[PDB]
Ligand binder design. Structure first.
Ligand SMILES: CCCCCCCCCCCCCCCCCCCCCC[C@@H](C)CCCCCCCCCCCCCCCCCCC
Ligand SMILES: [Cl-]
Length: 117
């Protein structure tokens, strides 16, 4: 498991805030974490929200690739550059839909490393 245990407490405050703002359930998060996602704002806006909280996207859901790479471990760098080559730039009807399209693209491209918190 590439995910470090320190991240969980780090994201806790923003996670609670993002769920409250968007009407997100933990069941929805569990579902996307397992690779199942639909274009429901309560989960897609949650994903945008948490990314934004950690400066991974801007006000139009453009991804900050350098920040993203900075967060991932060494054994994931080339894979990430490859996945971002396929999945960026983001597109969609709004910020939440941009993140929906991104999620699927990434989950489809790297299912074994996918996770959502
Ligand atoms: C190569 C595989 C890619 C990763 C698989 C999907 C996970 C992507 C998660 C995005 C950031 C993950 C980094 C979390 C671990 C970093 C630990 C460092 C601790 C200090 C920083 C803590 C915070 C900066 C964590 C930020 C967590 C944000 C979670 C966002 C959840 C929604 C993501 C789904 C949307 C698609 C992501 C699309 C972005 C990914 C493109 C390229 C890999
Ligand atoms: Cl982008």
């Amino acid at each position: 498991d590439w995910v470090p245990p320190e991240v969980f407490d780090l994201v806790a405050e923003d996670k609670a805030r993002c769920m409250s703002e968007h009407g997100t359930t933990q069941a929805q998060i569990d579902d996307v974490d397992k690779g199942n996602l639909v274009n429901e704002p309560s989960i897609t806006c949650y994903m945008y929200c948490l990314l934004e909280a950690f400066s991974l996207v801007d006000d139009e859901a453009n991804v900050d690739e350098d920040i993203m790479l900075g967060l991932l471990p060494d054994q994931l760098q080339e894979r990430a550059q490859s996945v971002m080559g396929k999945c960026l730039p983001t597109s969609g009807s709004d910020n939440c839909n941009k993140i929906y399209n991104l999620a699927k693209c990434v989950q489809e491209s790297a299912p074994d490393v996918w996770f959502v918190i």
